[PDB]
Amino acid sequence: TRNGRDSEAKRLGVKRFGGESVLAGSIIVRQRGTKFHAGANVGCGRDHTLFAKADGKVKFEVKGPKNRKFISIEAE
Amino acid sequence: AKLHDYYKDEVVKKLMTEFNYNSVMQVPRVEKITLNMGVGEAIADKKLLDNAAADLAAISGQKPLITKARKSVAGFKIRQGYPIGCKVTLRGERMWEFFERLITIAVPRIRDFRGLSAKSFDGRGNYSMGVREQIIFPEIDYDKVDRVRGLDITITTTAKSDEEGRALLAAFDFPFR
Amino acid sequence: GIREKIKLVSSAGTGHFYTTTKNKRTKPEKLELKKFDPVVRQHVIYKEAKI
Amino acid sequence: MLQPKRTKFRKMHKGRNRGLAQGTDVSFGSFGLKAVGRGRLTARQIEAARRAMTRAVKRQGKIWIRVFPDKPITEKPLAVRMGKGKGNVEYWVALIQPGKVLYEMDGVPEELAREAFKLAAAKLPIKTTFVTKTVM
Amino acid sequence: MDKKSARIRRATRARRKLQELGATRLVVHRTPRHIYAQVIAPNGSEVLVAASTVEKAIAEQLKYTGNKDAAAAVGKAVAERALEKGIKDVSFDRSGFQYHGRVQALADAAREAGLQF
RNA sequence: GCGGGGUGGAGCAGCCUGGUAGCUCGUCGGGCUCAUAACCCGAAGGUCGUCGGUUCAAAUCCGGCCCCCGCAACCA
RNA sequence: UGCCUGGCGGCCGUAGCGCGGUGGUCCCACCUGACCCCAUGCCGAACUCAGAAGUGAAACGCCGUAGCGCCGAUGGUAGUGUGGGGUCUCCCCAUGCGAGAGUAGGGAACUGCCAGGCAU
RNA sequence: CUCCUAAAGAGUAACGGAGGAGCACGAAGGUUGGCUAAUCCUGGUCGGACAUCAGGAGGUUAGUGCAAUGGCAUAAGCCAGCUUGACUGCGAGCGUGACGGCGCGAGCAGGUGCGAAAGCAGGUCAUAGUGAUCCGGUGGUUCUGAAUGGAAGGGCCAUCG
RNA sequence: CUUACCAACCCGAUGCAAACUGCGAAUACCGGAGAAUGUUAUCACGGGAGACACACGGCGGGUGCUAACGUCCGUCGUGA
Ligand SMILES: [Mg+2]
Ligand SMILES: [Mg+2]
Ligand SMILES: [Mg+2]
Ligand SMILES: [Mg+2]
Ligand SMILES: [Mg+2]
Ligand SMILES: [Mg+2]
Ligand SMILES: [Mg+2]
Ligand SMILES: [Mg+2]
Ligand SMILES: [Mg+2]
Ligand SMILES: [Mg+2]
Ligand SMILES: [Mg+2]
């Protein structure tokens, strides 16, 4: 019938890009699905928010037999 | 294990030369006999399906497995998940002791017997045939009969083609019209 | 808009309670669960009661 | 009048018409009518040019229509102010870029194909040219 | 559908978890005739110790090389081979096999021999 | 521009609350009558305006389009 | 040291699929038996246990093969940052960046740890 | 709330283009173990285009309590066993908002479930399912109590309209 | 039985898409390092505001008729 509705933007996306130094608990990326997967020292929240489980620099890699993007923390 | 013993000694070496097999493992085998009883009308009342499966339990001595509807279809007006029919699969010697029980007792009983068909093969060497009457088995007594429901019988063989398939049951003296 | 709010009272002497919802049309049976009672600091059984 | 049998959506954005065309060579017949200009081709213009060519060769040989009007164009009716939602779909167009082959013909002599294409070009809003099949 | 590929699927989840935990795992492979045991480094590419029934040093003292008591011999052997090497706490990786029978007899034997898991 | 409707041949229920087509007339068949009406008795006829979506299932729900009925179309 | 097999990895199609061939001392697979441990919403099929008569048929591994997938330049083209211009719905010039597709071609994976067998 | 417009970080308007929500669930939650679709072909009692059975093809074209999008094979999909972590107190550190707020969260303490164990569990694949404050109700409460002891009332905690 | 015609799937060839993607830039943005340059140009706290009617031009778009010195956003410039 009639349009005119929308929802508030959710501010998704990457918060800390490759090489950035983060503290433990820092949110790395907010996402709906697991577009990015948790690697080493990275947790996956209930809404699939990837957060650093240790200090260090974030690192993006593509691994596995399905070429999936992983995010890990190079502990430094 | 009558025909089971008759299998490993007689029908193997006639078949081994009939197809000129290199290894004995190439000869076809008989894995399982599965008896299906599609009730279909149990949706009206389910008191008749248990005694329906009670018959199939007496034909093979195994408690049947009640199959459920895989998906809802209104063409036969059933919703997915309804108890729609029972089945029993037979392996090992219980398959054999049943496999002779029909070929020597299940064959000489069917009304107006004319012989089985040679075209009822899956195309890869597996046979299937349906019996219309359940009073053809010695177990099920005529006195206790609430309905005349039949059932399907399919023969799962390791054969690769129908020629190797028909050759195996022919070795067991199967009636081929 | 059918689920009614209920409370689960601890079987212990303490008046502590949880609150939850329940569809009283499909599930007429009372709800009983083992939940942590922070007053006695033990896992006791909680029974249903009116809110 | 050509028109999609069904669509995922009824109305589309205006968009732009930049770039050069794809399908720039005669691929089915032997002669083609290639557009050298840029613009839109309504479904009526396509049908009008087809009838002009179909009658030109007295319904002989084969004719291909390489374009298809898949873009809906909306219009607001008269005496209607701005706003109150997008207008209703009135006709369909095919976006044309320079080099697009519009029609192809086969089974007729070249001198007859030129006159057929010349009669059809007079119905189209864009400048066209005559092309022939070449060895790729 | 081979039983092997269906078994690797059963073992993938626990192995990913052990890899994420950075733990040194005790991998067990079971065949109808033999049984095997490996202790892999946390990186998953170094074999620290190993023991199995295809080693004649252990096979000669067994009636049959693929029964339940044969697995207890490998479980006892792999643990004492690892204790003197320096590893004390590991994680048992059943690797798609049910924790029952032979692999269970291998585990508790290694548990009895002083391997903490 | 908003609301309500299109169902046997005719006029109307049922849609709201998805599964099950009902009422009165007419029509067909047999009776009563010398004959017709009235009357009594029995039986048929709709796939629900059309196309599409939702559902296991659509007269019913939700569209689009064909239609008829409406109400409103104001201050210069 | 070489060959061969098993396990765990790296890597994630140049590594896949098909087609052809091939392997059983060991290994592996099928296999044998099943009262019992255990198991089937029925079935020792699977899972599990006890075994070693048979077989490499299947599966798996290996070898070959360009049928397909896959990889893939060079050049050109599209686009585009900045500056300028035109006939300005679209383009052009200077300069920087520069695809996608396609073409030549490549290509029948490579590799680590441990273990066993065999030759040495 | 979801997608597009939105110009490859975030955000971004219109009486712009399309759809949804005002819930549901003590299992549809937790855990352990297992499992892998759609569709089609062939054969087969009643049985039919479509029921259950068997085989092959196929490879997720299926499924997900519901819109869309992003996800999902280690399945987040399907089945069974046992269960109540749909725990209490907290919380490094971040995300997002003018603010009120909203969101994610390892780890710590107490107590608990499942598992042989490593471990996992502070609801559900994620994102909608909602309403500030005042006033008042109900339960609790080593708080207060207008001379004093009580009480009323108030506070604090839990919760309701 | 053969018969104005329509025709799924598959195969070959050819296009189209804001709400298609087995591809994929230039830019922009985030972070790190390094010089030179810039009157700290940056951040925080505090005192005082004003402003919340914008306009046109370029570029990228929605809307409209790729109509409007139209309208609504993004970004830059100028006017203000
Ligand atoms: Mg076996
Ligand atoms: Mg390229
Ligand atoms: Mg953005
Ligand atoms: Mg705890
Ligand atoms: Mg326990
Ligand atoms: Mg959900
Ligand atoms: Mg007092
Ligand atoms: Mg204002
Ligand atoms: Mg304003
Ligand atoms: Mg403005
Ligand atoms: Mg203006």
Swiss-Prot record, chain A:
Pfam family, one: Ribosomal_L27
InterPro entries registered for this protein in UniProt: Ribosomal_bL27, Ribosomal_bL27_CS
UniProt cross-references to SUPFAM superfamilies, sorted A to Z: Ribosomal L27 protein-like (SSF110324)
GO terms of molecular function: ribosome binding; rRNA binding; structural constituent of ribosome; tRNA binding
Top-level lineage group: Bacteria
Gene Ontology terms: biological process: assembly of large subunit precursor of preribosome; cytoplasmic translation; cytosolic ribosome assembly; positive regulation of ribosome biogenesis; regulation of cell growth; ribosomal large subunit assembly
GO cellular component, one term: cytosolic large ribosomal subunit
Subunit structure: Part of the 50S ribosomal subunit. Cross-links to the 23S rRNA. Cross-links to the A and P site tRNAs.
HAMAP family per UniProt: Ribosomal_bL27 (MF_00539)
NCBIfam families recorded: L27
Similarity section: Belongs to the bacterial ribosomal protein bL27 family.
Name this protein carries in UniProt: Large ribosomal subunit protein bL27
Species this protein is from: Escherichia coli (strain K12)
Lineage: Bacteria, Pseudomonadati, Pseudomonadota, Gammaproteobacteria, Enterobacterales
Gene: rpmA
Curated annotation (Swiss-Prot), chain C:
Cellular component GO terms, alphabetical: cytoplasm; cytosol; cytosolic large ribosomal subunit
An annotated Gene Ontology molecular function: structural constituent of ribosome
PROSITE patterns from the UniProt entry: RIBOSOMAL_L33
Pfam family, one: Ribosomal_L33
Keywords annotated in UniProt: Methylation, Ribonucleoprotein, Ribosomal protein, RNA-binding, tRNA-binding
Similarity section: Belongs to the bacterial ribosomal protein bL33 family.
PANTHER family the record matches: 54S RIBOSOMAL PROTEIN L39, MITOCHONDRIAL (PTHR15238), LARGE RIBOSOMAL SUBUNIT PROTEIN BL33M (PTHR15238:SF1)
Record-given protein name: Large ribosomal subunit protein bL33
Organism field: Escherichia coli (strain K12)
From Swiss-Prot, chain D:
Residue positions where (3R)-3-hydroxyarginine is found in the record: R81
Membrane is among the record's keywords: no
GO CC, any one term: cytosolic large ribosomal subunit
Gene3D superfamilies associated with the record: Ribosomal protein L10e/L16
SUPFAM superfamilies: Ribosomal protein L16p/L10e (SSF54686)
Reported modifications of this chain: Is hydroxylated on Arg-81 by RoxA. The modification is nearly suppressed when E.coli is grown in anoxia.
Alphabetical keyword list: Hydroxylation, Methylation, Ribonucleoprotein, Ribosomal protein, RNA-binding, rRNA-binding, tRNA-binding
InterPro entries: Ribosomal_uL16 (IPR047873), Ribosomal_uL16_bact-type (IPR000114), Ribosomal_uL16_CS (IPR020798), Ribosomal_uL16_dom (IPR016180), Ribosomal_uL16_sf (IPR036920)
GO molecular function: rRNA binding; structural constituent of ribosome; tRNA binding
Entry-annotated residues carrying N-methylmethionine: M1
Biological process annotations from GO: cytoplasmic translation; ribosomal large subunit assembly
Record flagged with keyword Ribonucleoprotein: yes
Cross-referenced PANTHER family: 50S/60S RIBOSOMAL PROTEIN L16 (PTHR12220), LARGE RIBOSOMAL SUBUNIT PROTEIN UL16M (PTHR12220:SF13)
Function statement: Binds directly to 23S ribosomal RNA and is located at the A site of the peptidyltransferase center. It contacts the A and P site tRNAs. One of the last ribosomal proteins to be assembled in the 50S subunit. The simultaneous presence of uL16 and bL36 probably triggers ObgE's GTPase activity and eventual dissociation from the mature 50S ribosmal subunit. It has an essential role in subunit assembly.
Family according to the record: Belongs to the universal ribosomal protein uL16 family.
HAMAP family: Ribosomal_uL16 (MF_01342)
UniProt protein name: Large ribosomal subunit protein uL16
Organism from which the protein derives: Escherichia coli (strain K12)
UniProtKB/Swiss-Prot annotation, chain E:
GO terms classed as biological process: cytoplasmic translation
Post-translational modification: The protein has been shown to contain a phosphoserine, which was required for the protein to bind to 5S rRNA. However, the presence of this phosphoserine is controversial, and it has not been seen by mass spectrometry.
Example GO molecular function: structural constituent of ribosome
Ribosomal protein listed as a keyword: yes
Assembly mode: Part of the 50S ribosomal subunit; part of the 5S rRNA/L5/L18/L25 subcomplex. Contacts the 5S and 23S rRNAs.
Family to which the UniProt record says this protein belongs: Belongs to the universal ribosomal protein uL18 family.
Protein name from the UniProt record: Large ribosomal subunit protein uL18
InterPro entries per record: Ribosomal_uL18_bac-type (IPR004389), Ribosomal_uL18_bac/euk (IPR005484)
Pfam families assigned: Ribosomal_L18p
UniProt comment concerning the protein's domains: The basic N-terminus is not necessary for binding to 5S rRNA. It is however required for cooperative binding of L5 and L18 to 5S rRNA as well as for binding of the 5S rRNA/L5/L18 complex to the 23S rRNA.
Alphabetical keyword list: Phosphoprotein, Ribonucleoprotein, Ribosomal protein, RNA-binding, rRNA-binding
Record PANTHER family: 39S RIBOSOMAL PROTEIN L18, MITOCHONDRIAL, LARGE RIBOSOMAL SUBUNIT PROTEIN UL18M
Gene Ontology annotations for the cellular component aspect, listed alphabetically: cytoplasm; cytosol; cytosolic large ribosomal subunit
Region (Required for binding of the 5S rRNA/L5/L18 complex to the 23S rRNA): 1-17
TM helices/strands, residue ranges: none
Source taxon at top rank: Bacteria
Gene3D superfamilies from the UniProt entry: 3.30.420.100
